[model samples]
Target chain A: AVELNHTIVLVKDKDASATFMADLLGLPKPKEMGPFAVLQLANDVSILFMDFRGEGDIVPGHCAFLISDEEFDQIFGRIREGGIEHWADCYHREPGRINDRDGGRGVYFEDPSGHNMEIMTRPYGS
Target chain B: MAVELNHTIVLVKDKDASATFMADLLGLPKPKEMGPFAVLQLANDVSILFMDFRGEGDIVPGHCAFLISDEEFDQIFGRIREGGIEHWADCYHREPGRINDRDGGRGVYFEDPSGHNMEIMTRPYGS
Candidate 1:
């Protein structure tokens, strides 16, 4: 069997980006490992926020997380309370709103490094 | 109080072929086209949804890593060798055709059609 172990989140500042992700998603603070700020998920998977330094430009990427419906309320509340910009769709067409596509809630936002981050309550087509 | 990866949208030139490439290399089932996405589901129920760039600016490549069983590694490695795909023991691509034993397990790095770095390891790092 094959499972996604981890993914690299290219960012401008590792600490700031990692902190933004964890705070936005209600996850714990990321840990440091060999130039990477590793954010451990509930599952075995992890997200390693990496700084490119002078190697090259840090290109923004996309990542989505699945959370319990109850947790979604808390996280979503934090997003609104903190006044973070969010949209209902991926294209950012509908700002200050959330989408109820696939019969579940989902919202799109950007991290400090400008990586598109999403949190949803249901798997697509469920 | 719990969160897990739902899926990741990977920008590729051709969604169908890109998803197929990953499925074939990882020995997973073929991807299913959902809307404009070619969704490749992993064993853990997470997915890598391949989508066409569709004018999303420069398609910056990214890195994705997988954890596989030792037996699965041999099978997948065989496919890589037979397909004549260039692989490296390290992420830097300095050690060609070599698999590194790190953290007491085997690992190798290769790329997909979009040049997204893919790594397969039998053990998690720092295990």
Candidate 2:
């Protein structure tokens, strides 16, 4: 069976990028290997960070997470307290509010690594 | 449950080409059009969706790694060789066309039509 085991995230600094994600989501700190600093998510999947330092320009990527409403409340609070700007839309037209799409709450924010991060309580078209 | 990653966006010049490329290599069904994305569902229900690049300016490629069975690795590797894909052992200064056995199973890296790096391994790291 083929499954998404992990994906490489391009970041200027692995610790800063990985920790920002983990701390915001209340996850453990990233584990370091030879070249990667990885954040293990709730599921068996992981997000591994690779330093994009001089390797190539960091072009942002979009990654979405399916989260619970209670968890969303916690993370969104951090977004506000941490001064992370968030929006209801991918394009960031609606600010300071989450979208009630698919009968659930959703928000988008930019990570320190420059990748766009999305969080939602319900799956699309659910 | 806190959160689970459902999918990641990978850019492609044409959705059709990338859909077929992933399908042929991973032996998945043809990507179906849903929600403006040509989506291919992995075995674990995680998806790698090929959407047209909606961003302005030059695009930067993304990378995705897959965990597969031993047989799946061989099957994909067979197609990789048939297509003459120039692969590498690891990302940094590694030998080309060589698969590594670092996490107690095989792993290799290749690129899709849009030059986004793709990876497959028989076992996950830290197993």
Candidate 3:
């Protein structure tokens, strides 16, 4: 079967950005492999971070994760208690709120590298 | 009980064309529109949502890699050649028209309409 193996994300600092993502997703700390700080998710897909060489602008990319209801609460609590800026909608117009889209909770926030990260309890089109 | 990558948004100039281009090359189902996204569903239930972003500063393309079986790799690579698309063995665009034998598996690289680097490999890096 064809599956998404991994993705390479360009960030200002690989260590910091990888830590930020791993922490936000409640995953283990990233490990250094060759030239990347790699975070292996539960689905066996890895998110590898490489340091950007300060070339052009860093356009933030979007990545969304599907978590259980329990995990959603845990991560959302961290976002609230940790004072991370987040919004229910992708456009960031509804701040400090979680959307019940597709009958599940979801929220969006930016990581240290300015990548737009999202967590939802249910998949879309459910 | 575990978190999985649900999806990622790819900012493209034309959402339909980009989605079709990806689905065609990957031998996946055609994309369907959901809200503002042209959603290309993968076998793993993850999605690559294509959205039109014309007024943006610039699309700093992303790198997406896929793990495929050897047989599947042959089929996709055949389509890549049939389309006359430029492909390389590495991300640096070196070794064109060739595949990399990394980690005891074959790999190739190509770009989508939005300049997103797409990779197909028979084995995951580092196995």
Candidate 4:
């Protein structure tokens, strides 16, 4: 069976968005592959930032990345320290905390543009 | 720590889009939760379908899902048998096949609303 691979995000400017995501997630500059820019993370997963200049407004979507418990703690702590607002389930569970569903914990934040970014600890399967 | 739970996809019409997704992925009806309607899948994760009635046009974004090798074959086969277009590594790899990156295989397709759909095997990491 296949695992949850990475997601591709189309942005007005790939360079700018890639820089923003790299800075937010503490990642290095993305590698440019032809027209696409990719930010490879610790896991085998990555976030492909495509250059879509003049390509109408992008449909805002929320992407969640799975991390380890320690990574969650570290990342969430950074999110809080940075004074970023976070949520547990939706925009309801505020003030920074974790969820008990499948022993999962997560936090939501936004990137440079207005895209909702999420970090979690459990796959969405039974 | 946390795992890559689920991605939230905001659609114009929650009911219609949810029904389309359910039929496409062979999933059950989504559950209504407050202002948001969610399609909870087999895993604890879900796809939140927001009802943005009259909201400005949605920003088009692509989301990819990771699956197993066998699942990839099955999904890709379905994508083809359905007379749907499938690609590997962007639209260049036209034709029903797979990619050899990171020992991973994948195929890309689209939903009813023209959103890019990707099903892949293995994460995009290396030594």
Q: For each model in turn, which proportion of the native inter-chain contacts is also found?
A: 0.79, 0.85, 0.84, 0.61
Candidate 4, A32-113: lDDT as tens digits: 9777787766544556788666545655557667677787777777777877766666564564655656667666777656
Question: What is the C-alpha lDDT profile of model 2 across A11-106, one tens digit per residue?
Answer: 898889988888998788889987789888766688889888666567778888888989999999999999998899988899888999999989
TM-score of candidate 1 against the unseen true structure? 0.92
Q: Write the residue-wise lDDT of candidate 1 on A55-80 in tens digits.
A: 65656567888998998898899999
TM-scores for every candidate against the unseen true structure:
0.92, 0.88, 0.92, 0.59
Model 4, span B52-121: residue lDDT tens: 4355564343455554445545664575457544445544345445444444533344343434454544
- CAPRI-style grade of the A/B interface in model 2: medium
lDDT of each: 0.87, 0.83, 0.87, 0.56
Candidate 2: misplaced stretches above 4 Å? A55-57, B54-59, B92-94
Looking at model 2, residue B15 earns an lDDT score of: 72
Chain A alone, TM-score per model: 0.94, 0.93, 0.95, 0.72
Q: List the residue pairs that clash in candidate 2.
A: none
State the lDDT at B106 in candidate 4: 39
Q: What share of the true interface contacts does candidate 1 keep?
A: 0.79
**How do the residues B66-105 of candidate 2 rate in per-residue lDDT, one tens digit apiece?**
8899988889999999988789888552788798897789
lDDT, model 4, position B20: 52
Q: Considering DockQ, which of the candidate structures 2 and 4 is the better prediction for this target?
A: 2
Model 2 TM-score is 0.88
DockQ ranking from best to worst? Answer: 3, 1, 2, 4
